């Protein structure tokens, strides 16, 4: 689709088995989901912006479709205030910022 | 343009005759830019990031370019780790987000 940028760039994703609602981010270097569990190995990492740093899951290798396009790459977990859709993950649906 | 995104999405914008660097952000709803001078009053604002809540100073009716195009808007000021343009200013830009 082509997205208009008037309010929240939310779409639904498929991960872990679970529906959620994200935010394309073109600011976010790496996808970022709240609380969930996830299969197999992590490390802990430290992301941070405006308020500064959090502590996070990082798991690597986690498949997610995100408005219905499917795609593989890191994902991290921890207390965001919004799910986040980033980067490394939205070069892998051929996203673009056009104007 | 068309800007894919497998680096950050960074462009120049002018802003009070200055030329800086900024990213441009779908994730955020409002321009965040480092400390510098602006003209006029300015009104309180606060803003959540990933980290928490900060403070920012609020300036309406700014004249700034975006990558050469020419917007007038919102611009608020404060402790951010890179300068962001977000949605309010990208609208005006007509940019949106496309796969
Ligand atoms: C500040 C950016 C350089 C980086 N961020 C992405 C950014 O899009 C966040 C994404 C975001 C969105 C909502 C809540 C928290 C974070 N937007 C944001 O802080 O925007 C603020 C300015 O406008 C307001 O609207 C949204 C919050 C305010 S970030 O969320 O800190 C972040 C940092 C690292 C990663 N991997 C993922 C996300
Ligand atoms: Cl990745
Ligand atoms: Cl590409
Ligand atoms: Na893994």
Request: glycine share 14%; net charge positive; no cysteine.
């Amino acid at each position: 689709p082509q997205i208009t940028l008037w309010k929240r760039p939310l779409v639904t994703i498929k991960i872990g088995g679970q529906l959620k609602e994200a935010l394309l981010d073109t600011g976010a270097d790496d996808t970022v989901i709240e609380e969930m569990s996830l299969p197999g190995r992590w490390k802990p990492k430290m992301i941070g912006g405006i308020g500064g740093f959090v502590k996070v899951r990082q798991y690597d290798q986690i498949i997610i479709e995100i408005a219905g396009h499917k795609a593989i790459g890191t994902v991290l977990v921890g207390p965001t205030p919004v799910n986040i859709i980033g980067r490394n993950l939205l070069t892998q649906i051929g996203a673009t910022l056009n104007f």
